[PDB]
Each structure stands twice: as structure tokens, then as C-alpha cells.
Amino acid sequence: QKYTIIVVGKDLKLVERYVKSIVKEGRAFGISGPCRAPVRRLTITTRKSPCGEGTNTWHRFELRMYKRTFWVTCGGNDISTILSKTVVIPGIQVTVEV
Amino acid sequence: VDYPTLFADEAAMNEALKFIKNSKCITHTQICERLRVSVALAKRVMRQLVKSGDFAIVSKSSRMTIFKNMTKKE
Amino acid sequence: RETEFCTHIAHKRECRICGNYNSVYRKYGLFICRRCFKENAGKIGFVKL
Amino acid sequence: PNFRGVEVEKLATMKITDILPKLNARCRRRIGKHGLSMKHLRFVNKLRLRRAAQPSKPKIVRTHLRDMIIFPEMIGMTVSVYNGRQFIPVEIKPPMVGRALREYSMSYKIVSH
Amino acid sequence: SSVTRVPADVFINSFAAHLKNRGIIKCPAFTDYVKTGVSRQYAPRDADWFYIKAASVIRHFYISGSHSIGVAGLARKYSSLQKGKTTPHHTKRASCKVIRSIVSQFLGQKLLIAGERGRHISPNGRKMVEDFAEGLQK
Amino acid sequence: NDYRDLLRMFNTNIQGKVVLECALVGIKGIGRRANIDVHKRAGELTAAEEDALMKVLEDPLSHGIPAWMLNRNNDFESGKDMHILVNTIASTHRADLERLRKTRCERGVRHHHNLKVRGQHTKSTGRRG
Amino acid sequence: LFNKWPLTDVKCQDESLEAYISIDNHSFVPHSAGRWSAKRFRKAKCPVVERLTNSLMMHGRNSGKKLMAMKTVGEAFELINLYTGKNPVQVLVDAVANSGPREDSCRIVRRQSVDVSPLRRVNIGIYNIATGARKAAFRKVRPFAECLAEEIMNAAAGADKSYAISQRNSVERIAVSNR
Amino acid sequence: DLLERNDIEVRERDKYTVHTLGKKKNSVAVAFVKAGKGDILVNNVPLALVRPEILRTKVSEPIMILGESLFKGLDMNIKVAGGGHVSQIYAVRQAISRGVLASVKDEAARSELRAKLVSYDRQLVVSDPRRCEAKKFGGRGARARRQKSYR
RNA sequence: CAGGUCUGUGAUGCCCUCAGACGCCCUGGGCCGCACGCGCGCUACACUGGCGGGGCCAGCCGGCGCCCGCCAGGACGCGCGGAGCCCCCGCCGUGGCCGGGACCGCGGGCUGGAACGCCCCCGCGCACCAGGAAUGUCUUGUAGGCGCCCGCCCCCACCGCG
Numbered sequence A: 001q002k003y004t005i006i007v008v009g010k011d012l013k014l015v016e017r018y019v020k021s022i023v024k025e026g027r028a029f030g031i032s033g034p035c036r037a038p039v040r041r042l043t044i045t046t047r048k049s050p051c052g053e054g055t056n057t058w059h060r061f062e063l064r065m066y067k068r069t070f071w072v073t074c075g076g077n078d079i080s081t082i083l084s085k086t087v088v089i090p091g092i093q094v095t096v097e098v
Numbered sequence B: 001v002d003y004p005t006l007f008a009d010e011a012a013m014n015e016a017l018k019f020i021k022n023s024k025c026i027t028h029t030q031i032c033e034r035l036r037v038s039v040a041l042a043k044r045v046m047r048q049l050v051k052s053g054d055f056a057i058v059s060k061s062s063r064m065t066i067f068k069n070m071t072k073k074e
Numbered sequence C: 001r002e003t004e005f006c007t008h009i010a011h012k013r014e015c016r017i018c019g020n021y022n023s024v025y026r027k028y029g030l031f032i033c034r035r036c037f038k039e040n041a042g043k044i045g046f047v048k049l
Numbered sequence D: 001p002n003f004r005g006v007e008v009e010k011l012a013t014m015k016i017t018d019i020l021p022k023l024n025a026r027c028r029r030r031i032g033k034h035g036l037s038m039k040h041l042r043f044v045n046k047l048r049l050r051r052a053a054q055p056s057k058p059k060i061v062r063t064h065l066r067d068m069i070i071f072p073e074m075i076g077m078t079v080s081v082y083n084g085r086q087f088i089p090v091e092i093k094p095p096m097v098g099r100a101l102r103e104y105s106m107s108y109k110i111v112s113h
Numbered sequence E: 001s002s003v004t005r006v007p008a009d010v011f012i013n014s015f016a017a018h019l020k021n022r023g024i025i026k027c028p029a030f031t032d033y034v035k036t037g038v039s040r041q042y043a044p045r046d047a048d049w050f051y052i053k054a055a056s057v058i059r060h061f062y063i064s065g066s067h068s069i070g071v072a073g074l075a076r077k078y079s080s081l082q083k084g085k086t087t088p089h090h091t092k093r094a095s096c097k098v099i100r101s102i103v104s105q106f107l108g109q110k111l112l113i114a115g116e117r118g119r120h121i122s123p124n125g126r127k128m129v130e131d132f133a134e135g136l137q138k
Numbered sequence F: 001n002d003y004r005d006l007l008r009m010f011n012t013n014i015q016g017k018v019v020l021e022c023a024l025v026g027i028k029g030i031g032r033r034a035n036i037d038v039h040k041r042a043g044e045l046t047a048a049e050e051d052a053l054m055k056v057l058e059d060p061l062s063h064g065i066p067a068w069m070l071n072r073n074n075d076f077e078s079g080k081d082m083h084i085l086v087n088t089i090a091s092t093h094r095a096d097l098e099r100l101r102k103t104r105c106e107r108g109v110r111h112h113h114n115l116k117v118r119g120q121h122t123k124s125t126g127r128r129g
Numbered sequence G: 001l002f003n004k005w006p007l008t009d010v011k012c013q014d015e016s017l018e019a020y021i022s023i024d025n026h027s028f029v030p031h032s033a034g035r036w037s038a039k040r041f042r043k044a045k046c047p048v049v050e051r052l053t054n055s056l057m058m059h060g061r062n063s064g065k066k067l068m069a070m071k072t073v074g075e076a077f078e079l080i081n082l083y084t085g086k087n088p089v090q091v092l093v094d095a096v097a098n099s100g101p102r103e104d105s106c107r108i109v110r111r112q113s114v115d116v117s118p119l120r121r122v123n124i125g126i127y128n129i130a131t132g133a134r135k136a137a138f139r140k141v142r143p144f145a146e147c148l149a150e151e152i153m154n155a156a157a158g159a160d161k162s163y164a165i166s167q168r169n170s171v172e173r174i175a176v177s178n179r
Numbered sequence H: 001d002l003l004e005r006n007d008i009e010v011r012e013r014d015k016y017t018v019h020t021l022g023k024k025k026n027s028v029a030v031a032f033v034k035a036g037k038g039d040i041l042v043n044n045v046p047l048a049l050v051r052p053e054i055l056r057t058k059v060s061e062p063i064m065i066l067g068e069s070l071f072k073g074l075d076m077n078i079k080v081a082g083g084g085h086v087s088q089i090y091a092v093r094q095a096i097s098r099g100v101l102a103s104v105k106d107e108a109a110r111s112e113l114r115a116k117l118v119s120y121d122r123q124l125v126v127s128d129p130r131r132c133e134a135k136k137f138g139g140r141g142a143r144a145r146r147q148k149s150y151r
Numbered sequence I: 001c002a003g004g005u006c007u008g009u010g011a012u013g014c015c016c017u018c019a020g021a022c023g024c025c026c027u028g029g030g031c032c033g034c035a036c037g038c039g040c041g042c043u044a045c046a047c048u049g050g051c052g053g054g055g056c057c058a059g060c061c062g063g064c065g066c067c068c069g070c071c072a073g074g075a076c077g078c079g080c081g082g083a084g085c086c087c088c089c090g091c092c093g094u095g096g097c098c099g100g101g102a103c104c105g106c107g108g109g110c111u112g113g114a115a116c117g118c119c120c121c122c123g124c125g126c127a128c129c130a131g132g133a134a135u136g137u138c139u140u141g142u143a144g145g146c147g148c149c150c151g152c153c154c155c156c157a158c159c160g161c162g
Helices: A012-026 A076-085 B011-022 B028-034 B039-052 C034-039 D008-013 D025-034 D038-053 E008-022 E049-064 E071-077 E096-108 E123-137 F020-024 F047-058 F086-102 F106-113 G015-019 G048-056 G066-084 G088-099 G118-136 G144-157 G163-177 H061-065 H068-072 H085-104 H110-120
Strands: A002-009 A035-047 A058-073 B056-060 B065-068 D079-082 D087-090 E080-082 E090-092 G103-106 G112-115 H018-024 H027-033 H040-042 H076-081
Touching: A002 A012, A012 A058, A012 A076, A035 C034, A058 A076, B011 B039, B028 B039, B039 B065, B056 G066, B065 G066, E008 E049, E008 E123, E049 E071, E049 E096, E049 E123, E071 E096, E080 E090, F086 F106, G015 G118, G048 G066, G048 G088, G048 G118, G066 G088, G066 G144, G088 G118, G088 G144, G088 G163, G103 G163, G118 G144, G118 G163, G144 G163, H018 H085, H027 H085, H040 H085, H061 H085, H061 H110, H068 H085, H076 H085, H085 H110
Parallel strands: H040 H076
Antiparallel strands: A002 A058, A035 A058, B056 B065, D079 D087, G103 G112, H018 H027, H027 H076
């Protein structure tokens, strides 16, 4: 059975290692090539000032969300083996699907 | 101000055509200044003059129709 | 006072942090004060650049 | 003149439902589709009761209800609508049928520069 | 290819004339006293407008190829801006009821097929669009 | 080319030179709430076609003109839509202002004091009043 | 130009203006973004017809509308060829050459007369011919194209009627007086 | 319409041998040459019919620089997605010239067609990047700021 | 720098109120009231245009279908899917006019508990024919023209950020 895997990482460097680990754990289970979802840019522009006094300077805050595409043809136990096998780094999105 | 023609040229139309034919070139707006026709009327009579072949349209554009008499060479 | 208290129904969207009902800025589903968001947007991971 | 083609004598006898297609687009949405509300219906019943009671009664129907659209029956009733500080008296007349009480209550004073 | 080689506007005007003689569409009553679009405040002065539009809807469906998109998508194709406002001008879509009443009429005459969702040019209709293009080619 | 000069419909002066659609664009100013060619020009228009139009304008719901395309749509006297022009627009506008004067309404007071009714900023853009 | 009017023998007759003028490097139709605003004098290497078509796109309204302008100078060009029986580009080179004013009294209060560079004369000549047309193409019947062409023919002759010639002569006038 | 897998998705089979591109002002074009009878089509529309009618000459400049022999055998299929009308004609010209270059690229003869085309028109072969700038706060444009009320 | 923010907050001193509260809720009004002066804008003054019948290309990035309705919208199901300007062809013809759409009068919708909100259709046709002293921002994909998206939003942008 083939299971869909999606990983969302805010920091590109933190997901960069995770994608390298994903190939080095599921190679026998034939993990899919890591297509990268186009960045989802969460953008908030807020006036920098607590008040509205002074020039209207704007504070731009952006969270870039990166996502990767993975599929593994393996047993029900085998995805769980890769889920334990992949490098665990904190604050990551883990997806198990059918 | 200007004279709105009302497409009134009848006996006068033939002499109006005579002057237009004499002029080396004609444009839809040139007639309206030279003889006070609406430029819309100028297109009306010009379509008849080209129908004979007195004039040759160098170029047709939505606003500007450039006509030089193919005739008048003789 | 059961009838009197809170008879009127309306949205009362406020910042999660402050409770102010103005500039809620729920653009991405964040119920966040614009002034309060300025205080704590680093933990949410938004970066200035 | 007959209001919207129903003669004034016929209008008082007529019902809002009977004159509803004849009435305004908002009136048809508010009463025909959305429906009225308990406060407004209790007010219509209160208006019906005092006019019916007829004990020689100067209630002058004090009301904070400006949302209410006038009903054909209310003709000849001196309603009083709180403009914000005071109840401004509003007698009912034939073209004021299916018209809100706010339109005839003076919410603000004029400028007088 | 065929109709694509022909200038689409030239093909649309020539085919609309053919559709009228061929009896395709047969314009409804409402179309004489209606102005296409919520943006346009003036009715078309063409008097053959419901035929020129009907060449546009069926040829644009030929352009769909296999899309099976609907009437609102075609309405967007003929949309323009609403003016007459102090506020700046913004694009408003074409009136759907005119567009619905030609795509339904085309399917009713079997020139179009309702495979799923909207409509794609029917094989019987596919000959018609190519046929006229061949007449234009010579 | 056949030409006729000024014509009068509903006591208005009509320029023969302009296209029929422009010629009727205003009747007594308050007029433009058909069977004739609209591009022919007012001078080109025949008496007979004008007579058919005269019937069309007097009774719009008789030749395929719609209810929505009418000047008046629900009335206040008959409850029915109609097309009124010339003096009737002036008499009904007077009648509509008189109805607004009759009962006290915000619509009534503003129309008299000349303040815009249903309008918003009277503070900065009603100047020259 | 417009599949017509080759610049085979079209050339400048005024030496100083010729150095800053283009009568050879013309791409078909007056278009092509060559960034002739770049560096310093890239104007010299820019097709005069483009320079003219770029002037028309000004005074708001027709701002950036090169295509409309390209077909308008094409309509004017055909009018020029037909009226004078002459390649329009040759008349154009002469019109923008004569129009450029050779003496201008800048401030250098007082003002002093100072000689004008060939590039400035090249740019003023193009500018004045368009404004001579733009002004006479406002609430008038003749289209912008017919004025642009009217202006060009007189400018080649030097007839004061052309707005460009009158402004050139008025510029050299207040210059002679404030020498 | 922006740099997707759209580049090859339009044609299945009918393998094109020479691939070329022409991209300016966000308007990107992918040109595929099967080297058949020499005819050129852009977006299903023959190159001799181009929507701007004055800008058919701009598109037919590579063809005007070299003789008919070069285009006698080069069959080009072009697909322009995105950008704008004028950015699409400008893109077409760049792609057609990349196609001639790709036919003679291995030989030193690539130099001849690059010199002749470029000398007549710059950007016939090259593509000027000139991308759009970003609006900044306090203005309606990168180089435009709102009128200052006082001082 | 006593520039601005104690009215963003479980940041806060001093202070004021505290049970007919300067606490909180509930209802109705006000911020949008207008002789007038000004600041940021938006639409103009027409034909390098309005009209409007087609072609047709966007980017931050993105849903549609079927009928009913002039529209506005609505019913009903499903996952889908893209500008203006400009281009050609008509048309009007230098006429406050076929420019301009401000106000007004009937209606038809919508959102909400409610217009006093918005949208649309038929009307209606104000100034305005290029703006004095002054002034304001800009040098490449730039000025300008031209559309679109989101924020705050029940509805609504001549706004802001893009």
C-alpha cells in the first residue's frame, strides 16, 4: 500500500536535514522523490508605531511555510518503522496518509 | 458656430463631389472643415465617390480613412 | 437578570493576548491585536525580512 | 388618494399580507421573507389592544421601536418614537403605510447656524 | 489549425451570418431590448448582436477543446468596465442569462454536448466550426 | 439627401441633424424614461413612424417594452408602473415632494432646507449652498 | 518604416544635427526598447521615428500608448508622403533640424545668450513639432495625425506658421535682445 | 501561466528535436522545433497572423534578417504564457532567434547568425531583464511618494 | 527631544471613581450632524475621446457547474479555474454635444435581529471647455496611464499595504 507523506517546516534549514534523512531511512521502501510545494508566504504588514503618530512606517512580518512531497509503498508496520527511523528535529509537521 | 449639414446636399451635392474630386487627397475630417459637413456625412459621400473609383483609399483605419484620387492623373 | 445580561448577540473578536476588540487582524486565523502582535510575533515565527 | 391602488377606506380593512405584493422591496423581505420579531409583534398587539380598549385612553403609545414598519390598521394612531432623548409623536397617514417609524421620528435637531 | 488559422474575430463575424441563415440560435424576444453586461449601460446597435455573440460562444467552446467549462466563464470573456461612478472604474462580467440562452440553445440543437460540468464542442458541432473555417480558407 | 428641420414632440424642439437616438435623448429634458430605425436621423424620421412611437411612449407595455425599463415602477396612487414625461414628471415630482412634506420625515425636512437627502458629508462638500 | 519608406537616400543636410541624428539604424516600425535613456547620449543612436513616437505619448491621457502613437505617426507619414510626394523620413529629418533653436538666453536678475548644443536642438525640434500638433489637436476637427503632418512640412521649409519654427524664432529673439 | 510544467505539457508525442526559449517582462515563451516545412506557429496562431497588426514586423525581424533558406526547413512551435501583449511579441522574437542559433550552434557558423541578428537589433538574441520594482509604504509606487501637505 | 502613545494589554506609579459606580450589561440615538476655511484623495473637462461589437495577455497569485432572473441576486449540487489598457471594425463629429456624472424621483435585490449600508434597472443631467498666488513628488521598467488582490469587513474603498 502507498502512503502519502507531507512535511511542513517554517525554517528551511530545519526541513533541509529532514528531507536528507527521509531518503536515508526509506530507500528500501522506495520513498518518492522530494518535490517541494511552492512556499506559502504568510505576510502581515502592521504599522510599526503603537500609536499612529509620526511618519506612517510599516513593519512587514513574513512566515514562509515550506512543504515536501513523499510517497512510500510499504507495509502498515513499515511506515511506522520509517516514522521512528527519520531524524527527529523539534517543531516539525509529520503526515501519515493513504 | 459650425454648420450641422443634416445631410442636405442634393443639387449642391454634385458640385460638392466636384471640389472633393478636384482636391488631390481627401480625409474624412478635411471635408468637414473645408465644407461644413459632419465628418459622419463626409464618410457617406466618400463611400459613393470611392464606389465609382474616383478616389483610392491608401489606408483604412477605424478613425482615419486616407484617400488619394486614383484618377485626376489624367 | 438572566434576560438582561448579554441579550444582544454580536462578534466580540479580541486579541488572544490583550482582550482589546480593535485591530483583531484575523488574516490567517490569528486573533491577534496589531499592537499585541508587534509585541509577540517572534514566537509565531514571523520574520521581518 | 388611494395608497398604491387600494382606497384609504379599503386600506384600513385590508391586511399587510393582502397589500404585501403592493408594498416596498424591503417591506416584502422583512415581513414576507424574514418575518417580524417578538418585540414588534407584541407592540402590534399592544397597539391593537389600546385602540380596541377605547376607554375614553391617552397612552399615545410610547415606543422605542423604530424598526417597526407601519401596518394598514395603525392609521389614525398617534405613535411616539424615542428619537434618542424623547418620544417624538407620529400620527399615521395613508402614504406612511409600510414605512418604518424611524423615517418619521426626528433623531436629530436641525443645524440653525 | 483550421479555425485557429482563421482570425477568430473574422471567423466570428462570418459564422454569425451563417448561423442566422442556417437557422441556428433563432434569437429570443428579450434580446432586442437588453444591454449585455452590468457594466454596459447601452444596448448593442449591431441588431445582429445575438448572432455575433453566438459565433463567439460556440467558437470559444471550440477553443475549450475538452474543457467542458460553463456559461459564467464565457460571460467573463465578453466583460468590460463599469463607468459612471465618482469611484474608479472596475471590470464587471457579462450578463449570464444571454450567455446561458445560447449554450443551452446550442446543446438543444445538438451542436454542443453536456459531458460534465459545463459544455464542450460536440463532434457534430466540431464539423460545423471546421466546415466554416474551410469556407473562409478559400 | 432628403432633409427635414426641427420637429416638436411633447412641446420640445428636436434637431433634425442628430441621429434619432440622440434626437429623443431628452424630451422636455425629462422625457427619455423603437419600431423606427434609430440611426435614420430626426429629419429622416417619417410622420407615420413618429405616430407609432407616440403610441409606444404613451403606452409602453403594448409593444414589448418591459416593466423594469419604465420611468415609474410601483406608483403611490395606482400601485402600477407607468412611463410619464414632460409636465407629468414635474407634477409627480411635485406630488412626491408634497407627500414628503405632508407627513414630517427626514426626507421632507431635508428636501425643503435643500440639504442632500440620503447623502452623507454635508460638512465639507455641500459648499456654495 | 511600416513596410515602406526605406532610408536609402534619406539623410541629414545640416552637419551639426547629423552627428546626433539616426537615418540608418532603424528597426522595422518605430518600436524596440533599446534603453536609449541609459548612459549619456544614447539618443543619437535611437531611431528618430521612435524619438518622435515617444514624444507623442505625453501630457497624461496618451501616456505610454506607443502602439496608438506608432499607428498615428504612420497615418501622418502617409499624409506627408501624399501631400509632398516625398519620403516622410527625409521631410522629418529636415523638419526637426530647422525647428531646433540655435541661440537660447538662459539665466546663465539678468539673462545671457548662450549657444545651444546640437543634441538639445535635436530634442527641442522633435518636442516642438509634437506640441505644435498636440495644441492644434485639442477641441478641433482635424485629427492629431493631420496637425503632426501639417507641422512637419512647414518646419522643413522654415515657415513661421509651424509652432516649432515660431518658438525657435521667439527663443532666438529673446536671446538676441538679452545678449 | 508562470514557469510551471506547462513547458512540455501542451504537446504529447510529435517529438520536437530543438528546444529554445524567449522570456522578457514575466512573459515566458517555450519554442519547440520539429524541423519540418519551416512554418512557425505561436500559441496555436500562425506567426504570419499576430494579434497586434503593426507588431507583426517586430515578430518577423529574425525572419527578415536571414534569407528564406534558414526558415525553409525549420518548423517552430511556440507557446507564450503570462506577461502581456507587448511582452509576448518581444518574447516571440527572442525564441525564434534561439531556434536558429540551436540549429547551427555546434558549428562556428552559430557566430554568423548571432552577429547579423544582434547588429540589426539588440535583444533579438538577448533578453533585457528590466523587471518591475516594489511599491514602498508612503507612496503609490517605487519612485513615487504621496504629496506632502506642509513643507 | 519633557515628539507621540497611561484610549492595546494581568505593563505601570501617583491619582480618580467604586453599588442612583467613572464596574458591567440592555435599549434608543451621536461620531456620518453643516453658513463656511483647509489637508490626502477620486472623477472630470472630450475625438491621442466617449460609444461598444468582437479578438486577446497578467502578476501578489488563484475555485466552479446547472438552471431561474434585465439586473441585483437566488435555488440547486460539485470541486475547480484568469484582467484592464491595448488590438481591429463600426459609430458620434468639435455641439456643455453622442464629453462629465454630481444630485434627485419610482422600483428590484442583498447582509443582518435590525439601514440609517451596499448593489442594480428605468429615469435625472450640477458645476466642469485645462485651473491665480503658490506648490508636491519623482531619472528604467522610472514618471504616468491601466486593471487586480488583501487588511480592517455583516454590508460597503474615491483608503492603506501590495
